[PDB]
């Protein structure tokens, strides 16, 4: 469970442990966004092997921390449907030019539900929002897309330039640290807007929030495994260079597959429990 490193002094070891304890509460949760933390590995100061190895441990413990926190979306996914159901009852009483065209959108809005897979979750968020913004635009008699295959872009309606520039800073700051979000001091409600428009705006906000969290999480998750294979392919080339009991031991550890981040967990646990034996293979000082 405890991580191990070779060249670094205990100050930097504790620095990385504290960097990892505070991951969720840290802004910009991305190891590639903190180049000084990678410089803490002591690039250009220690041997190529020890640099590569402390970096592999950094990436493995970072990916393990991601899995350990693993941002749950249970409450917002249910709040999104609870919020979604509002627009239907707000739109029923409203008079439309062609009520059947909007009844189709209310029906798309009311059959919303989330499949168990995380993969199909983002698609409902987008289809309902397309059904809702188009509904709100029919509410205001605003121009609609007509070309075949074209679709209205999801965008907030009747909101100030400063106000959308302000909420987009929030929705962007969700992308750089998903696990925690700070709700805006500003409220999307407006006295000038129709109640349906306000419900649509809050629905769009929750939808863009869900989409920003999902896409960024999956991006980090695949990137970590990409760097991990990047490291193991080079580390094997380094270990082949100098055969000994312990250099030949780390290679037989690295022979295994890297896919499927549970396999990275396997590699990290086997790499820790067998650390004592090959620690002398890596030069230090």
């Amino acid at each position: 469970m405890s991580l191990q490193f070779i060249g670094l002094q205990r100050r930097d070891v504790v620095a990385l442990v504290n960097f990892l304890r505070h991951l969720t509460q840290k802004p910009d949760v991305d190891l590639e966004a903190h180049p000084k933390i990678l410089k803490k590995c002591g690039e250009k100061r220690l041997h190529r092997r020890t640099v590569l190895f402390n970096e592999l441990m950094l990436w493995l413990g970072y990916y393990r921390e991601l899995r350990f926190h693993n941002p749950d979306l249970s409450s917002v996914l249910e709040e999104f449907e609870v919020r979604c159901v509002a627009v239907a009852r707000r739109g029923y009483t409203y008079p439309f030019g062609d009520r059947g065209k909007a009844r189709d959108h209310l029906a798309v809005l009311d059959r919303t539900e989330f499949d168990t897979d995380v993969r199909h979750d983002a698609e409902i968020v987008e289809r309902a929002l397309v059904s809702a913004v188009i509904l709100a635009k029919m509410s205001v008699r605003e121009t609609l897309v007509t070309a075949i295959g074209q679709t209205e872009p999801i965008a907030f309606v009747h909101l100030k330039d400063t106000e959308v520039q302000r909420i987009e800073e929030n929705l962007e700051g969700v992308r750089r640290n998903m696990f925690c979000v700070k709700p805006l001091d500003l409220n999307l409600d407006r006295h000038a807007n129709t109640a349906l428009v306000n419900a649509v705006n809050k629905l769009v906000y929750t939808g863009r929030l869900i989409m920003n969290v999902r896409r960024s999480w999956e991006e980090l998750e695949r990137k970590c495994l990409a760097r991990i294979q990047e490291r193991c392919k080079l580390l094997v080339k380094e270990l082949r260079m100098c055969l000994s009991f312990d250099s030949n031991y780390c290679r037989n550890i690295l022979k295994h597959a890297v896919e499927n981040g549970d396999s990275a967990d396997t590699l990290l646990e086997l790499l820790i429990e067998d650390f004592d034996i090959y620690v002398d293979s890596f030069p230090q000082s």
Binding site: V85, A88, G100, R103, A107, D110, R111, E113
Partner: protein
Amino acid sequence: GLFSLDRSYEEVKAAVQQLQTITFRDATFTIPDPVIDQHLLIDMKTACLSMSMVANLASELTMTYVRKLALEDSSMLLVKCQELLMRLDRERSVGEPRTPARPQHVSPDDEIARLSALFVMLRQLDDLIREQVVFTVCDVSPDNKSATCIFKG
């Protein structure tokens, strides 16, 4: 025939026996079971398909039309019928249903083939849909042995 597929269950095994023996205003006459050798005969199977196709093909199909007809309101009951489509027995939960389920995106031409296959099954069912009188007895002989019926048909 609809139970011919379910003879493993004791409840159906008993209910079949109850359907088997009609109780009429006269001496009773049990009805032979169509099922035999664990397997249903071809005629009842085709007729049960004629019924179950009409029972199932209509449920997925009629919403695409009722949603459009309910707009007009001249008749004034198709809006009430949109809720009839739901086929819920208990009052709706606090969950999904607000509108009946409707088919999505359906490719332009297959909708004609499903429509026409709905009508092909009523033709298979028509022989059983409407029985027709062939006699109307006016007086009966004593011992109910002869009767004198005006012919119909």
